[PDB]
């Protein structure tokens, strides 16, 4: 996969991702907030194409993500993120993809996701999140 | 179960917990650092006996936790924390308990666990961690 690292911002306005229902999460792009202005993040694309695109448009600043969760599993020999769900104080977006494999979740009691990093090959291999008050 | 919330400190010196290889995590207690003095956290005890005690004494400050992981699952009709494992930059402590049910994990690329909170009845029901740079 190709590594990526957006760094840290001041919050999240929009998540653009893609997935396929037989495979996994494909591409990933975030529109951050930067001091109350939109910052259009790099668009991290899979080496292949075919995925169904989704736009998660949050009602910023009142709406924010409280939990990220997903499944990892094996697709044609690759262990990847097969599913993602984003739960905010307002509602749940997802699951997008295939919800089979080993689960993971990052629930947040206090604080904000303010950036993403990770790696994408054919699919989303893994990701980390920057957190801040 | 009975709620506990130790608050936030400067770091972690020692974790004392108990577990049963057929059930789940029981007692939990932490010796934090507070500006260079050990802060002896309240021993948060299970309602029941019969657990095995473990002392995780860390080489503070050069050694620190990088990943907490575990399983959650049924015991007696309750969803509880069935196992924990603590990985530092120096070694791995655990798994302690029963490594069955739903996996979870919190790996940390940057920052420190500085506090625990949660609830313990017969077993560790749930927990959260305070993070700081």
């Amino acid at each position: 996969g190709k590594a990526f690292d957006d760094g840290a911002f001041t919050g999240i306005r929009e998540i653009n991702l893609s997935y396929n229902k037989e495979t996994a999460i494909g591409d990933f792009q975030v529109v951050y907030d930067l001091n109350g202005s939109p910052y259009v993040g790099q668009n991290h694309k899979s080496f292949i194409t075919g995925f169904t695109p989704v736009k998660i448009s949050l009602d910023f600043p009142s709406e924010y993500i409280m939990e990220v969760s997903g499944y990892t599993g094996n697709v044609s020999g690759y262990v990847v993120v097969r599913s993602l769900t984003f739960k905010t104080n307002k509602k749940t977006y997802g699951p997008y993809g295939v919800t089979s494999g080993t689960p993971f979740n990052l629930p947040i009691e206090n604080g904000l996701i303010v950036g993403f990093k990770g790696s994408i090959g054919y699919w989303l291999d893994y990701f980390s999140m920057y957190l801040s008050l | 179960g009975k709620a506990f919330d130790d608050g936030a400190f400067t770091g972690i010196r020692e974790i004392n917990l108990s577990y049963n290889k057929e059930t789940a995590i029981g007692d939990f207690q932490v010796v934090y650092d507070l500006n260079g003095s050990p802060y002896v956290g309240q021993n948060h005890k299970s309602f029941i006996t019969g657990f095995t005690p473990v002392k995780i004494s860390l080489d503070f400050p050069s050694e620190y936790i990088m990943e907490v992981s575990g399983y959650t699952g049924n015991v007696s009709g309750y969803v509880v924390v069935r196992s924990l494992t603590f990985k530092t930059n120096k070694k791995t402590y655990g798994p302690y308990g029963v490594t069955s049910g739903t996996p979870f994990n919190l790996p940390i690329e940057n920052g420190l666990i500085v506090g625990f909170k949660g609830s313990i009845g017969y077993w560790l029901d749930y927990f959260s961690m305070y993070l700081s740079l």
Binding site: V79, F127 | S132
Partner: peptide, 16 residues
């Protein structure tokens, strides 16, 4: 120190 500010990071998930 360096002059780059820092931020808590948690992860990775995705079989690592």
């Amino acid at each position: 120190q360096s002059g780059i500010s820092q931020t808590v990071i948690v992860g990775p998930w995705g079989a690592k």
